[PDB]
Structure 1
Amino acid sequence: MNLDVWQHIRQEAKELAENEPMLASFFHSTILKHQNLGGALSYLLANKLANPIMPAISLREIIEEAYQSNPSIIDCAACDIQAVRHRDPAVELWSTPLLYLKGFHAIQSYRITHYLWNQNRKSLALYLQNQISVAFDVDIHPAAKIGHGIMFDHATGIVVGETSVIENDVSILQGVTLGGTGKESGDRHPKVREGVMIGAGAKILGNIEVGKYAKIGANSVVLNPVPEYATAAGVPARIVS
């Protein structure tokens, strides 16, 4: 659930350090030498988003503070790991999401920009919003609201707008946009309810509702609300009974 997640990854790292000496020091530095998930995650995120403007060493303190303050940030990471492990047939190890999956890195990094944005650090948040778009190819406005148990499989090209809401247990694939229309401010982005699965390349535009457990077809363009448990596909999207 949480303690299980970190111990599954802890036990795995030991074995993978033995099988691949070239990464032994990486497994030790990232996983094996820390006492909890936050230690591994702040380390990995700091390194992936580093830049001389804001070096890993500086970034890590900012990340740790965030974790110390709102610990739930780490619980959500634990749940996201479990989601990928449970919904992605290609994933066979608990440590894989944590170490190599840019979609998962993008999500946890967004949790940091979301935290900064709500701590009155808009500049640093926009600066990291871009770092995240660059390092992971995922662009999430810091003010978007995203829950836990979320999976961004492959992730390249995902874009989530300012007023977006993604509830728990949502899965999103490469090239999917949750964007808006109009040159005005206010609610103009999608509300994706829990359990929703979005196919690769789908574009959901406007402040529209995406019912829970709905399935959105690859390359579908959703412009109108999608009932709960329904399947929308096509351009524009239609409900396929």
Structure 2
Amino acid sequence: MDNYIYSIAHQLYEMYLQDEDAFHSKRDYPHKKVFTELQKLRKIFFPDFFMKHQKITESHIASELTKLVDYIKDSVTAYNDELFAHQCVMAILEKLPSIKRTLKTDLIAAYAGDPAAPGLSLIIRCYPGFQAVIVYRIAHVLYECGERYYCREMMESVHSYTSIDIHPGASIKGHFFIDHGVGVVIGETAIIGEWCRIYQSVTLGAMHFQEEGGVIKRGTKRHPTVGDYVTIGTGAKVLGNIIVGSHVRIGANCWIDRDVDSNQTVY
């Protein structure tokens, strides 16, 4: 695994070197301490914003990547087993370059969708929707390996830190932006296309009225599918195994229970 880490850290470092200036800084930002997965991934993906400049080298990216790998491996092993952990973490490592590319697009979307943002640096440093998506994109790779415990725990850390509630099972394309974010809920089987803009208190999920009865069916597709270029306004509750088309605008406090066709505004 250490040799694969070296190769992945090398690729991520070369990407860092080739990133546009907006993804770089010569500033030494105030040191913060957040939960482990975010702390580590912040340094790995955007070292200029979370490390002293005198320290960014490839070797240091590799060093942080190793600390992260060892931590996730340990946690996956606790809930599962040693072999399953190795395979899942190799899968995360495999996807880190593509995630890095996607996270860049999420930043572009954040700046493009928010008149309050002065530059990418502030989004990177402290935008809660962005902190959540960083961790989500890794948690999802775990889910894709069949893991069902630690990937949820990781997202519950995100949940506590940002009040954004994204199940690791959700599938989310790039140029993704959650603004403000408190009360956002995105379910296990939610599917979200490119250029989705989501506001505070938005649910892309499900409700289960008590059938007593007692014990609800496990899993199955039961959360919305959302197309490209969708904007979901504050307080909107989109519920059930329903399809929202592309280029859809959803108004504030809307209660959506059925399919919504492409190229529409709902209020």
Query: What TM bracket, shorter-length normalisation?
Result: 0.7 to 0.9
Higher mean alpha-carbon deviation, 176-185 vs 224-233, is at: 176-185
Please say if residues 216 and 231 of structure 1, whose CA atoms lie closer than 8 Å, have aligned partners that are also in contact: yes
Please say if residues 211 and 227 of structure 1, whose CA atoms lie closer than 8 Å, have aligned partners that are also in contact: yes
Residue type of the alignment partner of 1:153: D
Distance 1:31 1:159, change over 3 A: farther
Give 1:7's match in structure 2, choosing from 21, 38, 55.
Answer: 21
Higher mean alpha-carbon deviation, 118-127 vs 190-199, is at: 118-127
Task: For structure 2, list consecutive stretches of 5 or more residues without a partner in the other structure.
Answer: 1-14, 32-46, 76-87, 209-215
Displacement of 1:6 in angstroms is: 4.8
What count of residue pairs does the alignment treat as equivalent?
Answer: 209
Please say if residues 181 and 188 of structure 1, whose CA atoms lie closer than 8 Å, have aligned partners that are also in contact: no
Distance 1:95 1:35, change over 3 A: farther
Higher mean alpha-carbon deviation, 103-112 vs 181-190, is at: 181-190
Alpha-carbon separation, structure 2, partners of 1:31 and 1:222: 47
Partner in structure 1 of residue 246 of structure 2: 212
Partner in structure 1 of residue 200 of structure 2: 174
Task: For structure 1, list consecutive stretches of 5 or more residues without a partner in the other structure.
Answer: 55-62, 234-241
Taking structure 2 as the reference length, the TM-score comes to 0.68
Displacement of 1:34 in angstroms is: 3.6
Kindly indicate whether residue 263 of structure 2 is the aligned counterpart of residue 223 of structure 1: no
Rg (Cα) greater in structure: 2
Alpha-carbon separation, structure 2, partners of 1:203 and 1:228: 18
Give 2:94's match in structure 1, choosing from 50, 69, 91.
Answer: 69
Partner in structure 1 of residue 232 of structure 2: 198
Alpha-carbon separation, structure 2, partners of 1:212 and 1:35: 42
Kindly indicate whether residue 126 of structure 2 is the aligned counterpart of residue 100 of structure 1: yes
Please say if residues 91 and 145 of structure 2, whose CA atoms lie closer than 8 Å, have aligned partners that are also in contact: no
Report the secondary structure of 1:122's partner residue. Answer: coil
Higher relative contact order (CA 8 A, sep 6+): 2
Distance 1:28 1:87, change over 3 A: closer
Displacement of 1:27 in angstroms is: 5.5
Displacement of 1:159 in angstroms is: 0.5
- Please give the root-mean-square deviation of Cα atoms over the aligned residues, in Å: 3.2
Report the secondary structure of 2:159's partner residue. Answer: helix
Report the secondary structure of 1:231's partner residue. Answer: strand
Partner in structure 2 of residue 30 of structure 1: 51
Alpha-carbon separation, structure 2, partners of 1:179 and 1:186: 13
Displacement of 1:5 in angstroms is: 5.3
Displacement of 1:195 in angstroms is: 0.3
Over residues 158-204 of structure 1, what are the superposed CA-to-partner deviations in whole Å (9 max), with x where a residue is unaligned?
00011100101110011100111344332211111000000011110
Please say if residues 137 and 157 of structure 1, whose CA atoms lie closer than 8 Å, have aligned partners that are also in contact: yes
Distance 1:30 1:156, change over 3 A: farther
Alpha-carbon separation, structure 2, partners of 1:111 and 1:34: 23
Taking structure 1 as the reference length, the TM-score comes to 0.75
Kindly indicate whether residue 130 of structure 2 is the aligned counterpart of residue 116 of structure 1: no
Distance 1:155 1:31, change over 3 A: farther
Distance 1:35 1:173, change over 3 A: farther
Please say if residues 5 and 78 of structure 1, whose CA atoms lie closer than 8 Å, have aligned partners that are also in contact: no
Displacement of 1:8 in angstroms is: 1.4
